[PDB]
């Protein structure tokens, strides 16, 4: 409304925000899963 | 074999000396680069033939292929250089001193 | 020995003809007879001035195509291979690459001449 | 350039070094080097101005000569040992010739005079590619033959490179030449350690690349190709000043920043191998670099040089050029000393 | 009374082709802002060819002085 | 999708868009020659967009709010002061000329962007190709200095060659006494002080350097005032112009792409306007520059990036 | 529409009637600046008015060409442009003015 030229970032790029947030949560989930799996494997290999 | 290889080594060395010692013309320097390439080709082919190492004789032909590609690039650069400074004299090739 | 002999005889024959030509006829030499020729009127400049070439691009392309002929020439021996699938595939790839390069230089008005 | 030509040339530029690094046969490594040279030349001569043609011709002549000498080394090794890779029993002169020619390709002093001119006569993005990517293929070959190299020759090249680059950077008032001389100095440092521990050469190369790429992006942000031009940063784009300062200091080598770790670890290894005299000289002379970086910092961030009226209009426009990689690489190249143990 | 900030005289130190000047380099000049250099025009000279009179295609008596490039 | 190599490959090809009336037409003439009158009608009849002549506040109007900004932010130059005192010791003359040239450069970039993006021709009242007439008049009078002229010439050398020339150049010729009388009639107190020598130098430039040079690269259409009256005639001449002899004929998709990429980034357009040549008229000085810059970035809507100022009304910043 | 004009270099005009009206009207406008007694003004106005009247009357291109008796309508257009340019040049020259000078006594005498 204010800018004579509509700003390039006028509105959120909903595809971009969704991709970013989904990737972030996916990375966190995968990381915690791998940490648990690796702890279990370490204990198995070293006899607790 | 050994004397021939020594002579080819001297030929390459003389060509390299000519390359490193300029003399006004860039096309002449390109020709010296060619002379070095030819000496190397001959040395490689002689070595392969004398060893009977047929599995290595593709390598010399690749040497020729890439040397020709480089020569083509050099000649194109010459085209640009002449289209600018009117000739191919390397003295005019000194704008980047400053 | 035989190829050397025949080629040396050819060289000697040509040189002998040149020597006969240059040492038999009566020679009268003066400057006007010895000056260059241009259709009756003296030259206006040297013949060693730059002579721009309008086909330089195709000259360099001729270098490249000569080398690709170089890559192709081993085919008569290659076809005797036992890995015919690979040989044929590689030859087809090489010829296709040659053709595509020619097509690009054609469509970019490369084979045309500068004016 | 059209998309097809761009794709082909960039693919060849990417391929060259990949071929060199992945190839076992020395001749195929040489093929990789030749690919790199031929493909880079047109990108250099893109702007089609007299300076561009001058630089392209210089680069082509120098690189072609060096590559022919490398090919001689390979061929003589073939004659000697009936193989296509340097072995433990290859002649010392052959290996020294390979070392010389790769040094000339890389730009080490004394074989360095060509580099600053080539970097000055070409745009900034091609300056980045030349001063970063084109160093990977030559260094790979040396890393592959580090057991065989002559410490005397390598240390002569290293010390001369440090001295010449440090002295050279002082005088220059052109950003591209300054980057070239910084490249020569850091290259002296990378080569100094190659005979002893090549992993540190790789470490220093990666640090140098992460420090240099963002600097070239910063320069490209306004085409600031001179000290005066960069001085106007405080008006044209203020926020970038902190990174420019910190990255310049890191390249200089002040401890708290990452740029310290290369020099520190290299000195550690050199003295472990008893190279005290050379290490001390290099550490001493690597301070003129800090000097002629501090001068840039003075000019840009710690003082406000006279500005221009027309920059008022620039202030009105909007700009979008700072990528994400500038931020990422700048932070990674300045604030990563604490994680040093993982890097070595 | 106010923080001194660089002036034109101070900033013109960092303007020469080389900063620490020398007698040898005193004739150097700063490189052009864009890489283009104002070079002296190359006078393109075209060959001059008589093309006659004594030419098979000149009809006997024409001195068609031609100016040719290539 | 901001124009880039990807956009060009997937589409957005200019030669496809260019039509009969995708041209650049530039009116020209001495002051108060009816330039705006002619240009508005030409554009409206030929379906093209009208571009008012670039002024001191063109950039301020084209960016952000669009209201004229304080002269401190908009160039610290005044045409009123130029007329009241030409030979001012504050460099008003050359500051004005350089600022106006840079503004014209920006407007030319904008018009080229429009033409290449949508293929709708553009009518410009004056062009960077004709701006030098005023500078020549100033120098012929004792107003500005040879060093100012050198700076202007160098900046033009650095900027002008990048772009393409106008398709057609229309010069509305009006004699010196006639323009003087029209200025008196308009009766702007500062404008009336202009000198017939200054106007005569303007005309001499326009007819001795501009039109000769333009004729090489573009179609020229000279008119008198009575011909300029009735735009339909000029419009008809343009309509039946056959276009040749110009750099515009050697362009293609992959030249328009790079020209468009240059134009689209305005800062890249203005890059060489800010070359660090320390001309005392244009050298602002650190303290004043910092003060002005801080105030500007404190102006409403100019603190942050376009789509990021919340005081203005931008929303959803946390996901932008 | 005509496939071509027999004359080489002359491009077929897509809008001949409008082009002809434009040119003739423009020339009529130019001729007003001449003095009324100007013989050029009088004669050229007669000719242009006749041609413009025929242009308005006949819409068919072929029949209009037959009327104009100039051959191809493209050539007629070219001649109209020539007339306009000549009208401007005559305005500059001022040929209506009296004889510049008399010939010497017997300049045009023959046999001598
Ligand atoms: C140790 C051994 C192991 C190796 C490990 C690796 C070591 C690191 C390697 C060395 C790193 C140096 C790499 C240099 C990369 C290139 C530098 C350069 O000159 O470009 C500057 C480049 C400028 O890009 P830009 O500002 O967007 O240019 C504007 C574009 O024209 C904006 O418009 P555009 O559309 O033209 O964008 C360019 C376009 C152009 O695309 C192409 O030209 C190629 C393909 C085109 C196909 C059609 O690309 C595309 O958009 C995709 C086309 C679809 O900036 C960079 O990307 C450099 C970032 C730093 C990366 C270094 C990472 C090191 C870690
Ligand atoms: C927490 C702290 C985290 C710190 C985060 C960032 C720190 C920022 C500072 C960045 C600059 C300093 C980094 C310098 C550095 O990484 O060490 C030099 C480091 C030293 O390597 P090296 O231990 O002497 O041996 C490498 C072997 O020649 C080559 O072979 P290799 O047997 O040693 O193994 C190579 C290894 C390389 O793994 C990497 O990705 C290393 C890349 C390091 C980049 C910086 C991180 O594996 C891979 O190539 C990836 C395998 C992918 C396919 C698997 C299926 O340089 C390299 O790793 C480049 C070698 C080429 C690999 C491509
Ligand atoms: C240290 C090296 C200092 C070099 C000198 C840099 C410098 O002089 O700055 C330009 C300065 C000119 O200042 P200015 O003309 O008033 O306007 C520049 C502002 O960007 C005017 O823009 P602004 O006021 O609208 O934005 C101010 C900005 C605040 O941004 C800044 O301007 C300050 C950024 C540097 C902070 C250094 C923190 C030191 C940490 C020690 C460890 O935002 C904030 O107020 C809070 C944001 C949170 C702080 C940002 C931290 C992010 C980077 C952290 C990297 C740390 C590297 C160490 O000169
Ligand atoms: C060892 C001696 C090397 C040969 C010296 C030839 C004379 C010379 O001046 O060397 C440099 C020469 C460039 O000299 P020039 O451009 O002709 O200018 C005149 C300089 N007095 O550059 C050259 O002419 C190229 C010399 C190559 C010599 C290769 C063979 C040397 C055989 C011994
Ligand atoms: N000194 C100087 N004055 C300029 C320059 N460009 C414009 N002006 C001045 O700005 C004013 C513009 O007035 P006009 O010539 O009438 O332009 P216009 O009002 O937009 O359109 P028209 O009335 O038809 O002419 C003139 O006084 C002049 C310039 O580059 N230098």
mmCIF file of C-alpha atoms in Angstrom, chain B residues 5-45:
data_model
loop_
_atom_site.group_PDB
_atom_site.id
_atom_site.type_symbol
_atom_site.label_atom_id
_atom_site.label_comp_id
_atom_site.label_asym_id
_atom_site.label_seq_id
_atom_site.Cartn_x
_atom_site.Cartn_y
_atom_site.Cartn_z
ATOM 1 C CA UNK B 5 66.887 -40.212 -26.653
ATOM 2 C CA UNK B 6 69.670 -37.849 -25.612
ATOM 3 C CA UNK B 7 69.348 -35.991 -28.909
ATOM 4 C CA UNK B 8 65.586 -35.709 -28.496
ATOM 5 C CA UNK B 9 66.102 -34.387 -24.970
ATOM 6 C CA UNK B 10 68.439 -31.724 -26.337
ATOM 7 C CA UNK B 11 65.907 -30.855 -29.040
ATOM 8 C CA UNK B 12 63.193 -30.351 -26.438
ATOM 9 C CA UNK B 13 65.564 -28.299 -24.295
ATOM 10 C CA UNK B 14 66.435 -26.024 -27.219
ATOM 11 C CA UNK B 15 62.760 -25.579 -28.065
ATOM 12 C CA UNK B 16 62.037 -24.682 -24.438
ATOM 13 C CA UNK B 17 64.926 -22.218 -24.453
ATOM 14 C CA UNK B 18 63.449 -20.565 -27.523
ATOM 15 C CA UNK B 19 60.057 -20.454 -25.827
ATOM 16 C CA UNK B 20 61.401 -18.828 -22.672
ATOM 17 C CA UNK B 21 63.470 -16.320 -24.671
ATOM 18 C CA UNK B 22 61.004 -14.154 -26.585
ATOM 19 C CA UNK B 23 61.752 -12.305 -29.814
ATOM 20 C CA UNK B 24 58.987 -9.862 -30.764
ATOM 21 C CA UNK B 25 56.524 -12.299 -32.396
ATOM 22 C CA UNK B 26 53.909 -14.288 -30.480
ATOM 23 C CA UNK B 27 53.252 -16.698 -33.345
ATOM 24 C CA UNK B 28 56.924 -17.669 -33.220
ATOM 25 C CA UNK B 29 56.550 -18.519 -29.532
ATOM 26 C CA UNK B 30 53.517 -20.644 -30.354
ATOM 27 C CA UNK B 31 55.651 -22.429 -32.942
ATOM 28 C CA UNK B 32 58.279 -23.158 -30.286
ATOM 29 C CA UNK B 33 55.561 -24.608 -28.058
ATOM 30 C CA UNK B 34 54.705 -26.837 -31.010
ATOM 31 C CA UNK B 35 58.346 -27.856 -31.380
ATOM 32 C CA UNK B 36 58.426 -28.947 -27.756
ATOM 33 C CA UNK B 37 55.221 -30.918 -28.303
ATOM 34 C CA UNK B 38 56.679 -32.708 -31.319
ATOM 35 C CA UNK B 39 59.871 -33.643 -29.493
ATOM 36 C CA UNK B 40 57.826 -35.064 -26.623
ATOM 37 C CA UNK B 41 55.612 -37.005 -29.009
ATOM 38 C CA UNK B 42 58.642 -38.581 -30.659
ATOM 39 C CA UNK B 43 60.208 -39.471 -27.319
ATOM 40 C CA UNK B 44 57.009 -41.120 -26.094
ATOM 41 C CA UNK B 45 56.467 -43.080 -29.302
#
